[PDB]
């Protein structure tokens, strides 16, 4: 598996019941969030480690079709049969370089 790109942002989980975003793994912070390409079936990968412990707190499938929202310039998001996922990036600059990672991965799949 092959990193296509690096990108700094708290990850969030929508919490359905209380209507509020909740931190990705428990713990407030900031990750350092990978696309990974699996080529031998050509497959792509959500993965973001917190920077303070190495935590892993995404690892999640990008479908073909998936449909990612870019609500402000510095906070993405999109959704799975069970969860919504958000990134809050940690500058413009990370965003667009995780949203290009994303499109790029959406286009060739
Ligand atoms: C129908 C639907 O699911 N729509 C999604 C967006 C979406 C569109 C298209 C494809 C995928 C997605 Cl996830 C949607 O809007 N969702 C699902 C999570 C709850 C939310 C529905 C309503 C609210 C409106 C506010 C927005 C949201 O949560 N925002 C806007 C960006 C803003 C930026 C940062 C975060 C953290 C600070 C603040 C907060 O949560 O207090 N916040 C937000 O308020 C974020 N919201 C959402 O993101």
Redesign the pocket.
């Known amino acids: 598996e092959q990193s296509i790109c690096q990108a700094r942002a708290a990850v ?1 989980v ?1 919490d359905d019941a209380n ?3 909740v931190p990705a793994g428990g713990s407030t912070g900031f990750s350092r969030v990978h696309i990974y390409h699996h080529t031998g079936n050509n497959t792509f990968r959500v993965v973001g480690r917190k920077i303070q412990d190495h935590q892993v707190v995404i690892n999640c499938a990008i479908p073909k079709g998936l ?3 870019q ?2 310039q ?2 993405h ?3 799975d049969a069970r969860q ?3 990134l ?1 990036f940690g500058s413009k600059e990370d965003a667009n370089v995780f949203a290009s990672a994303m499109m790029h991965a959406l286009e060739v799949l």
Do not use: I
Request: proline letters at 0%; hydrophobic letters at 30%.
């Open positions: 969030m929508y209507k509020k975003w449909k990612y929202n609500a402000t510095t906070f998001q999109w959704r919504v996922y958000g809050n």
